[PDB]
Write an enzyme that holds these catalytic residues in place. Structure first.
Site: not given
Ligand code: A1AGV
Ligand code: A1AGV
Lengths: 305, 305
Positions: A43, A148, A150
């Protein structure tokens, strides 16, 4: 009394020397530089405002080698020219024109639920912390990752060989984390997208609970040990109805049974009773079962094996 | 729900490059090589069968420079010729004829009760694990150390500067550990001898318990928050009678109060009530107070400060 158990990680120096920053478009994250290859989450190719549910096949086609910038910061600062790129599962495999002179002896492996591994948390290609986790039965980890992070990596070590097993990808709504193995598969049924995903139900890791009860005995705490025994077969039937993993014995657990003289089956019975309540008593300072320590942890940290 | 807190250590690579093996007579342990100096515990001078209650002044007089052998194993293997020796408190200061080319920017500091630091556990001059601990109010740590671990080091980091604060010396009868600061003093009232020593009584670290309750609020867990407030002065009087440290606020705690909108004094009241019992409820998965996380841990790991 202190049990002599801590959350023990491997020393991180060998892996620190492999971490790099990967930038593509509007995204920057961490990558792992081994030989002439840099691994990172795919990603990184996604525009920072379209992480919701990306079409990674189309993104990959749109990139060229100089769509990617790879930089090493600490130790030996460098820009690493990308001369090839490919996607495997949820990871990118970038080929760079310089072999990492600090590449350790290494393998790629997949970690199994209940097993422990070390994580090097990194931001912008700079290591910032290290911690250890057990892979949960639902293929999440209870980590500590921010935006950041990942591309941060998880690994075990056998001798001097580093077995890389995890590359961080995402946080779930309940605060747990998951990521990829280096074959590109995500752990569990997860996909690298930000939209709603079913999360599997977590469970107590029975083999680790047994390890912890043996740790208690080795510290002189055995009030929960009785002559009563529950067979592995009978325990495993009970476990399926009570949110426990099935117990599978190992040589490491056997060594604990021999040292303490307490049979596995005595502790399987104890677990079934303790699950119903500790009745005001503590075990190694705790009033609930602990499954975050492995049999190997107990053998190494307490018995010095 | 997972709180997003783990036991986070600093990456250990910079300190790994400073660890050496020190041998003297029948004893071998670890030392720390910085510039032209190797620090190690003075009981390396003790015959392995007379660790009970040594006369270190007489031992020091009996040694010469080639009574000591210093060896670096990993990275850049080397025998380091000792050209001087001196005792400071419970440490030896060996002067060697080669400056460590990997000496980091560093200071020596003393850590205070409740503050966290990282430990690099080493055996025979080889790093084997890393973990983090808080210094207990009775000047022990709840570590994981076996025979051969003395000379393992504890440290914090500010930027790229490593602040060395601990050199491991001994285990107590209750399984906890203690060691020296690099001014040669032992933490607490302990002496580097194997005979019976009074151990001071441990206490809950109130400032860390407050940090943990703020971590709970930041995770949406605030059932224990009420309008009721207890002043710092009143809490500290209560603490003296109930095995708590006195609370001393800091900017790090203030940042947590501002973020959550919950006043310190509300959580001091909560602690007094929770100490009497959680009444079947949990906080961040726990039915007892947690004091092993600092306000800085909560700011960094959860709020990303
Ligand atoms: C990469 O650096 C990053 C690591 C994350 C940031 C916060 N802590 C981490 O471990 N990864 C991402 O940002 C990642 C990217 C996708 C895989 C393309 N997305 C991610 O981790 O999203 C954060 C989640 C928080 C949350 O509650 N959700 C769940 C979603 C929200 C709503 C309810 C359920 C689904 C839809 C996403
Ligand atoms: C240094 O490598 C080593 C580290 C120890 C080994 C086990 N775990 C550790 O952290 N340090 C020592 O061996 C140290 C040496 C002296 C300071 C010279 N001694 C030590 O740690 O002794 C082990 C203790 C176990 C124990 O119960 N006691 C307390 C004694 C026993 C009896 C009751 C109280 C006193 C007298 C000693």
């Amino acid at each position: 009394h202190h049990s002599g158990l801590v959350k023990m990680s491997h020393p991180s120096g060998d892996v620190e020397a492999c971490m790099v920053q990967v930038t593509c478009g509007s995204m920057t994250l961490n990558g792992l530089w081994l030989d002439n290859t840099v691994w990172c989450p795919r990603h990184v190719m996604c525009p920072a405002d379209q992480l919701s549910d990306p079409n990674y096949d189309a993104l990959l086609i749109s990139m060229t080698n100089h769509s990617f910038s790879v930089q090493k910061h600490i130790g030996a600062p460098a820009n690493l020219r990308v001369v090839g790129h490919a996607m495997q599962g949820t990871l990118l495999k970038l080929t760079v024109d310089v072999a990492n002179p600090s590449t350790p002896a290494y393998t790629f492996t997949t970690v199994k639920p209940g097993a422990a591994f070390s994580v090097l948390a990194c931001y912008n290609g700079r290591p910032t912390g290290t911690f250890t986790v057990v892979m949960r039965p639902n293929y999440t980890i209870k980590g500590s990752f921010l935006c950041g992070s990942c591309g941060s990596v998880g690994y075990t070590k056998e001798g001097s060989v580093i077995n890389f097993c995890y590359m961080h990808q995402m946080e779930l709504a309940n605060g747990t984390h998951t990521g990829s193995a280096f074959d590109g598969t995500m752990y569990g049924a997860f996909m690298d997208k930000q939209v709603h995903q079913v999360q599997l139900t977590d469970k107590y890791c029975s083999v680790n609970v047994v390890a912890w009860l043996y740790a208690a005995i080795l510290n002189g705490c055995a009030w929960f040990v009785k002559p009563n025994r529950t067979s592995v077969v009978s325990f495993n039937e009970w476990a399926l109805a009570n949110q426990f993993t099935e117990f599978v014995g190992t040589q490491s657990v056997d060594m604990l049974a021999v040292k303490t003289g307490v049979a596995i089956e005595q502790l399987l019975y104890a677990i079934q009773q303790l699950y119903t309540g500790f009745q005001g008593k503590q075990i190694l300072g705790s009033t609930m079962l602990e499954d975050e320590f492995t049999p190997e942890d107990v053998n190494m940290q307490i018995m010095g094996v």
